[PDB]
């Protein structure tokens, strides 16, 4: 029988990147929450928050096959990035882990949003691309704040 | 005969990102070739070059199922980024497009390099993650140079 479900594969793929995101987030102290590489860039706190919430929305939508969920506003009082990070990483992990293998084949009607329909797997690949994209930026932020010992962009696990 | 048009799917996936990379590269004039967001960061030219060459090596290696190709040094006189970009984007596109669907299942012995064996498809996903990762950084560079009208990080359709 299969050693792992699709869900389990996606979760490992997710974590191989999100773990790095979290390592980077821990290098950001309150003093740099509002750091910006450029005058028109997001603050570090904005960037990190956007990554956590946006991915949660992708997973949430994917899990429930419901496109309306996608732009549902997340209101969270947490304030402390690191705690926020661990909270939403766990919520996101659990959503994905709870999916069946057919769920990944379900078609999502996203014309209203991406102007197109899409398999749940393509949709999740988009969420990954989005996370990897922003993590790349986060790398630049963190070096800008002066940190030089940075993790590999992706974890061997 | 390739029932899944794997190559063709990968190519479309590749281009949906590489096209944005190229749009960004065109916003970089010779005057900013050596721009760096931080004193310890790669220059814009170094970053863009690294993306073009690294991906070419992934594809090259994938196409020929030959791990030795991977760290083969690329020597290129071009100098002009944009031309370099279009040249290597086309070479990369052609390599991937010329692959059969079984090629994507071939196992690559990469212990010497990543300390692990890997399917060609996982290997190509790594190449994509790497491109997306660096394109994220390139976005920070380009805003830093002063450009504010930036493409979406990925082109759909
Ligand atoms: Ni975003
Ligand atoms: Ni790299």
Method in brief? X-ray
Which residues 124-153 of chain B have a CB within 8 Å of chain A?
126, 128-130, 132-137, 139-141, 143-144, 148, 153
Q: Which of B116, B129, B144 sits opposite A37 (nearest CB)?
A: B144
Give CA torsion, residues A85, A86, A89, A90, to 10 deg.
-150
* Structure's resolution in angstroms: 2.5
Name chain B contacts of A40, Cβ cutoff 8 Å. 143, 148
Q: Which of A17, A114, A139 sits opposite B156 (nearest CB)?
A: A114
Helix boundaries (H) for B69-119: 81-97, 111-114
Rounded-to-integer distance, Cα B154 and Cα B141, Å:
17
Rounded-to-integer distance, Cα B114 and Cα B106, Å:
17
Rounded-to-integer distance, Cα A71 and Cα A48, Å:
18
All residues at 6 or more sequence positions from B88 whose CB lies less than 8 Å from its CB, including other chains: B52, B53, B55, B56
Q: How far is A80 from chain B (nearest CA, A)?
A: 25
Rounded-to-integer distance, Cα B85 and Cα B18, Å:
10
Rounded-to-integer distance, Cα A153 and Cα A23, Å:
10
H or E element that contains A118 = strand A117-119
Rounded-to-integer distance, Cα A150 and Cα B9, Å:
33
The CATH H-level superfamily of A1-147 is dinb family like domain (1.20.120.450)
CB < 8 Å & 24+ apart, contacts of B79-82: B81/B25, B81/B28, B81/B33, B81/B45, B81/B48, B81/B49, B82/B25, B82/B26
All residues at 6 or more sequence positions from A103 whose CB lies less than 8 Å from its CB, including other chains: A62, A63, A65, A120
Name chain B contacts of A148, Cβ cutoff 8 Å. 40
Name chain A contacts of B41, Cβ cutoff 8 Å. 140, 143
Rounded-to-integer distance, Cα A73 and Cα A61, Å:
13
**Ligand 2 centroid, distance to B50 Cα (angstroms):** 7
Query: Quick one: which of B5, B43, B15 has its CA closest to B128?
Result: B15
């Amino acid at each position: 029988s299969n050693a792992m479900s699709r869900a389990k594969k996606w979760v490992q793929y997710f974590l191989s990147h999100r773990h790095v995101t979290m390592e980077l987030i821990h290098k950001i102290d309150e003093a740099h929450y509002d750091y910006k590489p450029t005058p028109t860039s997001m603050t570090a706190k904005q960037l990190a928050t956007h990554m956590l919430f946006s991915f949660y929305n992708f997973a949430n939508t994917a899990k429930h096959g419901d496109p309306s969920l996608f732009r549902q506003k997340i209101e969270e009082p947490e304030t402390n990035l690191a705690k926020l990070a661990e909270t939403y990483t766990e919520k996101t992990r659990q959503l994905i882990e709870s999916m069946s293998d057919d769920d990944f084949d379900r078609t999502l009607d996203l014309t209203a949003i991406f102007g197109t329909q899409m398999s749940t797997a393509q949709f999740l690949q988009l969420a990954m691309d989005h996370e990897i994209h922003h993590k790349g930026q986060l790398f630049v932020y963190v070096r800008g704040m002066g940190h030089t010992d940075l993790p590999l962009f992706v974890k061997r696990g």
